[PDB]
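Researcher: Go.
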Amino acid sequence: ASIPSSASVQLDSYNYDGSTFSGKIYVKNIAYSKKVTVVYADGSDNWNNNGNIIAASFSGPISGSNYEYWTFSASVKGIKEFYIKYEVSGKTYYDNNNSANYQVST
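Model: Structure:
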């Protein structure tokens, strides 16, 4: 782990065990009332108009930085790829792996 210097939001890690999709996300502490969402395509690669959504929750500050960790977990029947959306103070940021998304292998 190293803390991003500059990205507003950045995936730290995820797992998909065949039934539960979970992970952790670096989030820059820009303001409060943050919304951090994981948006995924299902097993058929259907985005469902960006309606397959898991809301992450605040975990804690990261010492020696202006970042925080947010975590997520949900029961997910199938998933091919995902990205992260971060809304704060009317601004909208993404970690979509530079438009490739994060690919979930089978």
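Model: The two ends are 25 Å apart (CA to CA).
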